[PDB]
Each structure stands twice: as C-alpha cells, then as structure tokens.
Amino acid sequence: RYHESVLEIADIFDQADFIQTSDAVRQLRALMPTLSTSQIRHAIERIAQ
C-alpha cells in the first residue's frame, strides 16, 4: 500500500540563488512537455538563435 510518485527538487530545497522556486516558474514548468536533454539543448540553441 503506497503511491510511487515524482518529487521535484524545488519541492525539497528552496535556496534563492540556487533553486528557482517562484510559483510563477513552478506553473510555467507545469506547462512544459516532458523534456530530454536534447530538448533542453534545442531550447537553448533556439533562444540563442
């Protein structure tokens, strides 16, 4: 009897210049599709472009 579930680091730590935990950023991430590292890299490359 248990529930396996993900726990974000933001939901553990809350240091101001370490782990961004603004509810703004929280909900904004909640909007994001699941991400691989290649996806993130594609994002950075796009912003840079």
């Binding site: 599709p33 594609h42 796009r46």
Partner: protein, 49 residues
C-alpha cells in the same frame, strides 16, 4: 465611439517578430523552442505558448 471591445494585450511593438513571438492569437507563441518528442505533427502547437 463605437469601440465594441477593448482588451489589454502584450505589446507587439515591444515583443516584436525579432523576439520570435507571435501575438496575433492573444498569447505569446514561439515556434521550435520547447517542443515535445514522440508525438503526431501539430501536437507541438500548445508548447509554443
């Protein structure tokens, strides 16, 4: 007189096409930044928000 409706939009003049943003739909939308993998074509669209 005769202004039917007055909205408060993000300013297109500031968030120009040079930003990559398209505001014609009433939300910011940027193509090919964050984008899901493993999905049918046209499933990428919501992530543009």
């Amino acid at each position: 007189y005769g202004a039917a409706v007055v909205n408060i939009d993000l300013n297109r003049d500031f968030f120009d096409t040079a930003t990559g943003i398209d505001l014609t739909k009433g939300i910011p939308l940027v193509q090919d930044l964050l984008v899901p993998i493993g999905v049918t074509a046209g499933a990428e669209q919501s992530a543009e928000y």
